[PDB]
Amino acid sequence: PRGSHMIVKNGEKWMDRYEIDSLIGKGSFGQVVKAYDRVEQEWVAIKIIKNKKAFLNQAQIEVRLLELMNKHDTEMKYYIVHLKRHFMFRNHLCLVFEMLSYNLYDLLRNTNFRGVSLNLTRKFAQQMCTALLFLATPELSIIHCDLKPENILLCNPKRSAIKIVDFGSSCQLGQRIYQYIQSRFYRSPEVLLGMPYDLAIDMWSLGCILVEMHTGEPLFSGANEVDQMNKIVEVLGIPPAHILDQAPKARKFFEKLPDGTWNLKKYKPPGTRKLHNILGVETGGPGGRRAGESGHTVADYLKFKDLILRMLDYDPKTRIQPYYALQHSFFKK
Numbered sequence: 001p002r003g004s005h006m007i008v009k010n011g012e013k014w015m016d017r018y019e020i021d022s023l024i025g026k027g028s029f030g031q032v033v034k035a036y037d038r039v040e041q042e043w044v045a046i047k048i049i050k051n052k053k054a055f056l057n058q059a060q061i062e063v064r065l066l067e068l069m070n071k072h073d074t075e076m077k078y079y080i081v082h083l084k085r086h087f088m089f090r091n092h093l094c095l096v097f098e099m100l101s102y103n104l105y106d107l108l109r110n111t112n113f114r115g116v117s118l119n120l121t122r123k124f125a126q127q128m129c130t131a132l133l134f135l136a137t138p139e140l141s142i143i144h145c146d147l148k149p150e151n152i153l154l155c156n157p158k159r160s161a162i163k164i165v166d167f168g169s170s171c172q173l174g175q176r177i178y179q180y181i182q183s184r185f186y187r188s189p190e191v192l193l194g195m196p197y198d199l200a201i202d203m204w205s206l207g208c209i210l211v212e213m214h215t216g217e218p219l220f221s222g223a224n225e226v227d228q229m230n231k232i233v234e235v236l237g238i239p240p241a242h243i244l245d246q247a248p249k250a251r252k253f254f255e256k257l258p259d260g261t262w263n264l265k266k267y268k269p270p271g272t273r274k275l276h277n278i279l280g281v282e283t284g285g286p287g288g289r290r291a292g293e294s295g296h297t298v299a300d301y302l303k304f305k306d307l308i309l310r311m312l313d314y315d316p317k318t319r320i321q322p323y324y325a326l327q328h329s330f331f332k333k
């Protein structure tokens with residue numbers, strides 16, 4: 001009975017149904033094992049939640065949100081991982097999902113972190129915006145709260161079809177329970193500033209993830225919250241004063257002057273690290289490795305950049321929503 005991780009034995013069979021094959025990943029929530037479902041005759045990934053009350057309760061919200069989504073007749077709900085079923089077993093909550101392939105970070109690593117074609121970036125972007133559109137569904141209104149290349153899995157290794165996983169920081173509009181959510185690199189300024197958030201935080205993460213997908217480098221690689229916020233300001237400049245005026249953690253990064261304006265405390269100047277230059281819009285793409293190449297015209301790069309900057313709006317209110325993002329000229333065929 002010792003420790004909070006399930007004692008998974010390789011090859012052992014549960015409820016005379018699931019044959020554990022191997023541990024395929026760990027984390028904070030617990031572990032994921034590959035197992036054969038002799039009853040449905042298929043390979044399943046079982047998320048085994050730590051026998052710990054905090055992770056049990058959080059998992060229980062994951063299950064509800066997954067059972068909410070996977071009952072909607074939409075076809076947009078095929079961008080979200082399928083929850084086959086869940087059960088209590090050896091005092092651990094087990095969520096049973098479809099087996100998927102590797103994540104968009106493993107994909108980046110496959111390319112020696114040079115990033116993928118703008119053409120493949122677009123395919124990922126359209127899929128993710130449609131998932132986000134699906135999550136913004138009134139009867140759902142789910143916020144993933146932890147989008148990153150790691151939580152975006154491929155269905156097969158050959159195809160570019162993606163699904164989102166890990167609804168373990170996930171919540172619905174009005175049911176916000178953590179002040180500190182998201183992965184730092186993909187954490188929206190409102191969350192950094194400690195403000196109440198909505199689904200607009202997932203569109204922020206998406207923007208960062210998309211630029212990373214094509215440059216193979218995190219857009220904002222902050223060591224801590226002060227480094228994180230500073231890196232964002234480097235590119236996007238000082239946030240709207242109207243936002244920092246309500247921002248609980250405003251004074252963790254900025255200072256108000258007598259003038260009533262904000263600036264930084266004791267890096268490149270605000271907004272002087274142009275995304276345009278990060279992307280190598282006019283100098284043959286990231287590291288110059290897309291120079292002359294098809295689908296990588298200055299024009300193509302401009303449309304992507306414009307959509308990225310609509311995703312990275314400091315203002316959660318004016319920041320672009322999945323429906324409008326799909327109607328963007330980056331997607332038109």
Ligand SMILES: Cc1nc2ccc(-c3cc(N)nc(N)c3)nc2n1CCOc1cccc(Br)n1
Pocket residue numbers: 024025026027031032045047081097098099100101102103150151153165166167
């Ligand atoms: C191979 C594979 N198929 C999966 C299907 C679903 C899930 C899955 C995993 C989690 N934490 N939460 C949900 N709701 C679904 N994880 C799968 N994995 C493992 C390789 O990806 C990942 C992704 C995230 C974390 C880890 Br460890 N590993």
